[PDB]
Write a protein that binds this DNA or RNA. Sequence first.
RNA 1: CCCACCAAUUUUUAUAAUAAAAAUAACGUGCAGUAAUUAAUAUAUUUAUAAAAAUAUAUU
RNA 2: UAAAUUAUGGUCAAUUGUUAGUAUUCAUAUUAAUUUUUUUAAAUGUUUUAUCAUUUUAUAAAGGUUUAUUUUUGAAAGAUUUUUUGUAUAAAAUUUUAGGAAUAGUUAAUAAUAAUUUAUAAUUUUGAUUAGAUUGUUUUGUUAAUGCUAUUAGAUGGGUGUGGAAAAAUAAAAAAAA
Lengths: 36, 49, 107, 51, 219, 49, 47, 62, 83, 26, 145, 101
Amino acid sequence: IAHWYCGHKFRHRFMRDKRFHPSLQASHDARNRFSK
Amino acid sequence: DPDRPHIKHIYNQTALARNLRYARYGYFKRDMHLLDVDKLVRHARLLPT
Amino acid sequence: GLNGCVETGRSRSEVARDLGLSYTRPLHENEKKQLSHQAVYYERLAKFKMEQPEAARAMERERFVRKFSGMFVKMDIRSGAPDFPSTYRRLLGTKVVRWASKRHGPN
Amino acid sequence: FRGADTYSVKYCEQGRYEYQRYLMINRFPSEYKKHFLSFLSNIRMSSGSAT
Amino acid sequence: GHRLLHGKREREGSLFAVANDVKRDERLLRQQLNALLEEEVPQTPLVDLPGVERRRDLPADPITRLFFQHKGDHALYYGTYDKPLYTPIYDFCHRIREATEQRKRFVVVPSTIETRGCARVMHDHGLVAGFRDFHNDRAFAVELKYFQGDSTINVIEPCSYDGRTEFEWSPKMMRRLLNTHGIHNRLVVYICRTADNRIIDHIHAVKENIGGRGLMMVH
Amino acid sequence: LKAGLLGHYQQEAFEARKRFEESTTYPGPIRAATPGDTRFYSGSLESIL
Amino acid sequence: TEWKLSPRDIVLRRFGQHTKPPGKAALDVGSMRGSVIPFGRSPGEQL
Amino acid sequence: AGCRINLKATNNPKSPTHTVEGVFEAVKALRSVSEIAASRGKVPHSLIYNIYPYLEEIRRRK
Amino acid sequence: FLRMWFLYGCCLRFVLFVLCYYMSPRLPSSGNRRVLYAVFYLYNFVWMLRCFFCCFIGLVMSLFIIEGGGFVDLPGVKYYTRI
Amino acid sequence: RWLARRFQMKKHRIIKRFRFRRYKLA
Amino acid sequence: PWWNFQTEHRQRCVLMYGGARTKNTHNANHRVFIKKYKRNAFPNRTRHHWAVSMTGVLSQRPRRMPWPYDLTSLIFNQPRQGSDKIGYVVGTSMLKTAVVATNHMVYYPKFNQRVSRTKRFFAHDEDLACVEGDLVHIKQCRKIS
Amino acid sequence: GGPGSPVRGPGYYAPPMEGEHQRGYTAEWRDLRNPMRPPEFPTPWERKYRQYARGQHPSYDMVYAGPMPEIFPMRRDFRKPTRWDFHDIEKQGKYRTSGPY
RNA sequence: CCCACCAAUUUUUAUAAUAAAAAUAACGUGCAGUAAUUAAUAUAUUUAUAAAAAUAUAUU
RNA sequence: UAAAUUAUGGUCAAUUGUUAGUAUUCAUAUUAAUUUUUUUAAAUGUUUUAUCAUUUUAUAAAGGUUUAUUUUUGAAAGAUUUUUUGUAUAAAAUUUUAGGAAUAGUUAAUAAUAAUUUAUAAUUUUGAUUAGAUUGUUUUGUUAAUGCUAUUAGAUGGGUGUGGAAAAAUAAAAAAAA
Ligand SMILES: [Mg+2]
Ligand SMILES: [Mg+2]
Ligand SMILES: [Mg+2]
Ligand SMILES: [Mg+2]
Ligand SMILES: [Mg+2]
């Protein structure tokens, strides 16, 4: 994982990849929970 | 205005703009002084007896 | 009349038309108005053109003048693109300000 | 790297045009009409001086 | 006049005898009704061997045909074991593992097509002693195999490790499974259902140059 | 649409076609009508010439 | 006899119906460090 | 042979005793081909060798 | 990778001296380590940082070249002047 | 543990600062 | 030796342009992001940019690619991709027009799974026979609007 | 690969397929790397080459006559610019080195 | 072993009369865990130059 | 609850080194790259003509484009003649941002080229529009890896309506009518 991508820690990159997950529930949660 | 809405689909099931919960009687208790009782009866959720 | 003809490519509407059938759902009042007002407007326009010659002539001349003087009369690729704001979205904002949006339909 | 490798004898024993599987290439009816007209025109092209 | 038969229950003509319930088990009731329909006038009864409804369904093996009898409609609803969120193969592997870790003699597992095919493959490779009530269409018993204390089965894992993802194996994948880790692997058995509803192992898959959807591995 | 139900739908379509043929049958031949023209053709638009 | 039902109240969830939604099961997806391969990353484990 | 050791889950990854214990446990949990063949009822040579007569050994005796 | 924030990806930085002073190292280490204030302009923006002054005190230097360090003794600085 | 205790202490300090701000507004 | 499709693609590249792009593009170059706005005051109401962003359509990680193998490919023999479709009518508000929502397959090689995405199309009905809820089969044609 | 690419599916594992797609992916599609037999001809052009569709070469007594591998210092890449090599296109590119050696 | 303010520099977000966090060997105040001096914890409320507690439940 | 059927009348093993192919060193990388003791070489006058003219000489302005941009064609090729000769443009899938919301010269129909009309129009939480970043579709690096990490396919409305076709005012190894 390139460090310049999506912040500086690994959880940021993990959540950014999770928001592109095929499963609708996981994508929706990953893109809405922190905005909540 | 629920009786004559100027928009379509008053309610929605989005993630950050859910307004169905904000239509129950508890929220209208605050403005019960100005409340229209017929409008409350026809458009409200979890109304008591 | 529910099936298209694979050999000729005709749709179910064409098949029903050729067979003399009729598959038309019950139309609402707005749909009936849509199908009925075309003749009314055509008759109105023809009556106006035959009743007021000077006004119709002036309007037609002005319309032709603006059409002929338009900057993009030539039918090149840019004019022949079905959706100019979407296809040539690079021009929007920086050069062309006519369209504030690059997308208007389901394409 | 791969200095000496061999292939199956079937490759050199095969006959010509014996590997072409029959595939159905379907087209639009308008494409069929266009292609048929083009082929008919090419066939009917006169043998004047260049054909 | 046409009544649509929606669902496998209605296609198979379930009585729905239980009031206001369609998902209730009915095999026992149907079996007892067939027993009643049986005749006790020379009236030869029917033997307890598992039967088939059509004479053409008898096994092609002459020895196996001795264990099957041609019963018209009483052949249905066979078996004593009942059905014991996850795939049937995942459940089968979990049951086999958790019973071979408890040193049990028999494990009741749900009898699906893939499950019984995998059971037959393991029996052929010698990982299972035998079977009980194998002709049952709901569940059957796998008899575990033990030698000098420890179990014959060491590790059994389904292909869908999470129980929700399926995989299609190409012939290249089958040949790689055969030559896994640089060695010829007839030791660890990979089982895949082909496109012809046929359950085989990687050895046969690479022999006949096909693939399939993987089910589980056991060694 | 889900592709896992294609086999079941094929079976149901076969059964429906067979029932149609068995019951409705065919009540006499029908004279063939001359096909018309289709507006919807493939490719780019053609000139009016 | 009588059905005094109201589709508007049923859709608008008047009287406060509850559906008991699923929890972490749908949300969890596992570690995505690598690709999803058959039999998982570590097929079989002994403790 | 090839050996891969992962001691991240342990509280102290830099533990030589953990390393040697894990390697020895992995070696202990290993079954030989002779033991596997004895348990299965098969010939050990008909498990790792590609000879076509061995194909009869993976079928059911009929 | 939050370290080397002021390098902006380059393996070295070109800075100019402004101030010089001393800071105590983290406990239990004791002393007065010398650190210099540096200023640099990148893309029309001025930036100020603090870097350890390990260069020899020879010529009167006005500019310095800054590289990464790694010594966890000084809280706040991670940049070191090339010799 | 002590992490949670410090978290609770910080929360309590924030709450009392907010109530002090409200009193100042009054 | 059997040469993979990469060899054929490189052959095509060498034919079209003298040689192939084998220059060792420095993938290890340190990409940087220099902020220009306030901590939370990014000039956009929808998405906020705060780091280096991925570029490219088919180079996005995780990978997404078309998956032709679906119900449409099982039923119809398409002369071209997406020539024939099957869907449900989801609107007849426009005169002589039927809106149809169809499904296609997107493949994720990293997770090894496929998903059904939805697309809307403006199908044409001449005699106004389509009603909302009709399962229809639609075909490509000339440009109508 | 889609346009201009004959690759039709992933080499080893794929998401589940249905019907003829599964049949092709598991049995019918071409498989160059298969060592036992080449991709079979359509009927009836397959029964007449039954004996020739086994293995690669019948010799099994081959004596390798090429250069010996360099064990040390075991160079990785050999991108020599040539002048008369007509197989430079195939030579260039990353290739897996797995053989008898 | 060991908590909060005060004192003392300073650092970031911010330039709004903002506001907030955090790093810090010797000060001055109050007394804070480690079966530990007091059943424990959590939520909510209240007082004092703003430390410590009190009050009221829930949990174990 | 089938109860131990009996010339045991053929034992003599295995190995001959021959193959159905992703295989894993926690990192110090006999991995890739930038960084120290300062790497070089080629140029700028297209030509022809019926002479203040006419004829032949058509994408590297780079900009800031994620539902996006896709195209040779009436010239040439080209042939003892039509009579112009001659269907180029259009679709489907894939499309970025820690702190996610509305968008709009708008959708369809039309006897309407160049819409005075009709409609309960269109886009979007399955992530739109605006704003930021970035030349889109197996080309680089690395690994046991369907992982991670690169990449100038150099592409488009007011400057002349010429031309078959604008791309037409830096260059970019190119033979242009004896
Ligand atoms: Mg960085
Ligand atoms: Mg932009
Ligand atoms: Mg697109
Ligand atoms: Mg010509
Ligand atoms: Mg988007």
